[PDB]
Design a protein around this nucleic acid. Structure first.
Length: 182
RNA sequence: GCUGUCGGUCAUACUGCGUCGAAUACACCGGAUCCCUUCAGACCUCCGAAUUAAGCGGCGCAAGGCCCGGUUAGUACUUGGGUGGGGGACUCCCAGGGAAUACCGGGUGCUGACAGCU
């Protein structure tokens, strides 16, 4: 009943692996990382890829302990996110800082892969979102965020093209439609 | 703890320079009649018994070398997959394997058979 179509199917996951015991080196140092992914499996894939860049570890030489799903605390109300990220253009790599507004962190990251692909043509494979912090209104530094802030904000509905539920739709009509609506 | 003869691994065992070695013992060392060797008793050979300087052994050196590990580096490179990217040159993701100098932390030996010596 809840509409599948609006959002991407991102969920946030914590991951914790630890390399692997040896007779030289027993009890290693443990790791932790928050990741965004489709699934409980595909988080672990992305964990081992990212941990390979940091430290001399692999999926064969490593061992994973826990994959905790994380969600929002309170998803009812709207909040500002300052997303840090990197991506790979056809020249080279660039770090960015985007600012997105939605009810959830999952909703923000869904909205960002749309935005990032649409502008910069950045493929899903290249993007790696580094950290997604919650931000106060008096903190966002982007101008498109600032217009929205303030109580009593109003927005008039202009040019009302309605996506008719199917079956409602007919190929011919009589009257010609009315878009200003009022 | 050592010295000799025959060795094993064949530099952790080599090379350079400097100090110290109880006791056998290796050694320098004295001689040319015979065995024997040359230009030449230096080498070699034979017959000997009136100083640890070298050889030999131990240790040192902000030593060179050598050996061992950590970095370098999950980098370079690479196997399988892609109706991935790119005008090409090339490059990224997925499933895997994965080096080498440079440079600093420790080392400089271990050993079998036989005969002897604090």
């Amino acid at each position: 009943k809840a509409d599948p179509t609006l959002q991407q199917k991102i969920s946030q996951y914590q991951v914790v692996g630890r390399k692997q015991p040896t007779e030289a080196e027993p009890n290693p140092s443990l790791f932790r990382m928050r990741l965004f992914a489709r699934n409980k499996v595909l988080a672990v894939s992305k964990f081992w890829y990212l941990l390979k860049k940091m430290k001399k570890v692999k999926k064969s030489t490593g061992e994973i302990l826990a994959v905790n799903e994380i969600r929002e605390k309170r998803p009812t109300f709207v909040k500002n996110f300052g997303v840090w990220l990197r991506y790979d253009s056809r020249t080279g790599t660039h770090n960015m800082y985007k600012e997105v507004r939605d009810i959830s962190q999952n909703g923000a990251v869904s909205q960002l892969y749309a935005e990032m692909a649409g502008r910069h043509r950045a493929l899903p494979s290249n993007i790696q979102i580094i950290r997604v912090a919650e931000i106060k209104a008096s903190q966002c530094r982007r101008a498109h965020m600032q217009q929205l802030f303030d109580s009593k904000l109003k927005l008039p509905a202009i040019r009302r093209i309605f996506p008719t539920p199917k079956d409602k739709k007919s190929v011919f009509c009589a009257r010609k439609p009315t878009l200003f609506l009022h």
